[PDB]
């Protein structure tokens, strides 16, 4: 008996195989590299998670986002927003985030 109703989290692959692709390291530009390496990036190749990590440092440390709404990043007059293809951006739009970064990498 087990009254502890817990999900059996394990590598159980009967019908499906986990949808997991090798996290593609993205290709940067000098502009990205300057922001990355200036916020503590040791890498020259980095995955999407690492973009979130390092690119987020840049937005934070420069305080390019709004004062009242953290989910609203202006970064206007900077290269960041520009390069994303935007005047400002919302971190709520995941798809936009991917594409704004993807705009700057080669695949």
């Amino acid at each position: 008996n087990t009254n502890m109703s817990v999900p059996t989290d394990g590598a159980v692959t009967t019908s499906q195989i986990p949808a997991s692709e090798q996290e593609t390291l993205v290709r940067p530009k000098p502009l990205l590299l300057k922001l990355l390496k200036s916020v503590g990036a040791q890498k020259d190749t980095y995955t999407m998670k690492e973009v979130l990590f390092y690119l987020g440092q840049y937005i934070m440390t420069k305080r390019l986002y709004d004062e009242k709404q953290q989910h609203i990043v202006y970064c206007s007059n900077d290269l960041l927003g520009d390069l994303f293809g935007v005047p400002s951006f919302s971190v709520k739009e995941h798809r936009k985030i991917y594409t704004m970064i993807y705009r700057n990498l080669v695949v």
């Binding site: 997991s20 999407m48 998670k49 979130l52 990590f53 987020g56 937005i59 934070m60 986002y65 709404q69 953290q70 989910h71 990043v73 971190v91 709520k92 995941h94 985030i97």
Partner: peptide, 16 residues
């Protein structure tokens, strides 16, 4: 969603 910190929602927006 309230006022979720830029620190988290940005760094946690990746698929998996």
């Amino acid at each position: 969603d309230g006022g979720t910190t830029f620190e988290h929602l940005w760094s946690s927006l990746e698929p998996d």
